Amino acid sequence: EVVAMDCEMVGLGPHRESGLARCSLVNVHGAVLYDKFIRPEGEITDYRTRVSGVTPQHMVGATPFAVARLEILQLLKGKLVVGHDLKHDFQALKEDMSGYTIYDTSTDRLLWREAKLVSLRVLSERLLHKSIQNSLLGHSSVEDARATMELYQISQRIRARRGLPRLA
Numbered sequence: 401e402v403v404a405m406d407c408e409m410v411g412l413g414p415h416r417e418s419g420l421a422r423c424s425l426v427n428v429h430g431a432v433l434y435d436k437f438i439r440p441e442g443e444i445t446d447y448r449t450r451v452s453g454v455t456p457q458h459m460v461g462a463t464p465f466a467v468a469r470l471e472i473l474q475l476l477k478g479k480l481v482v483g484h485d486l487k488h489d490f491q492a493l494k495e496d497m498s499g500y501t502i503y504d505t506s507t508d509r510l511l512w513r514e515a516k517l518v519s520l521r522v523l524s525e526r527l528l529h530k531s532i533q534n535s536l537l538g539h540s541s542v543e544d545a546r547a548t549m550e551l552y553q554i555s556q557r558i559r560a561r562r563g564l565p566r567l568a
């Protein structure tokens with residue numbers, strides 16, 4: 401009933417607007433449920449390779465945006481969606497967030513307080529003692545998704561240890 405998601409984006413059009421180029425979904429244990437490079441809907445004007453890890457070769461034969469979007473939305477349907485600053489991911493997915501139940505590490509005040517500070521890298525470093533997004537190949541949405549899921553588990557356990565009910 402819980403799934404963590406992270407997407408990587410490239411720049412589209414003359415104004416290099418963020419466009420969905422990769423999406424990774426993992427379960428509560430970090431098992432990868434979905435991981436695909438996606439052809440965004442528009443002209444790629446900036447691969448942002450150093451950060452997105454997306455190269456023009458990755459886009460060759462990649463799943464069309466409209467198709468991947470349906471696959472991802474189907475997997476998120478009815479579940480608690482875990483992630484960091486999910487607002488931007490749903491914008492990339494061109495999907496209204498309203499009906500979704502989410503858990504966002506970027507707005508979890510508990511993690512904020514415990515980290516004594518919101519970037520996912522900082523939270524991961526201070527609370528998970530895990531260094532992420534350091535590869536010269538670019539960020540890994542699988543690693544980023546796992547980091548948010550781990551942060552979610554930590555938050556739930558801290559709440560439990562302090563006598564607080566777990567987040568619904």
Ligand SMILES: O=c1ccn([C@@H]2O[C@H](COP(=O)(O)O)[C@@H](O)[C@H]2O)c(=O)[nH]1
Pocket residue numbers: 406407408409410411418448451452453533539540544
């Ligand atoms: O310093 C950054 C961080 C993120 N992004 C964009 O945001 C996407 C998601 O970033 P993240 O989920 O790895 O933080 C990247 O694939 C990239 O398009 C950047 O351009 N620069």
Ligand SMILES: [Mn+2]
Pocket residue numbers: 406407484544
């Ligand atoms: Mn992200």
Ligand SMILES: [Mn+2]
Pocket residue numbers: 485488
């Ligand atoms: Mn933001």
Ligand SMILES: [Mn+2]
Pocket residue numbers: 406407408539540541544
């Ligand atoms: Mn990422």
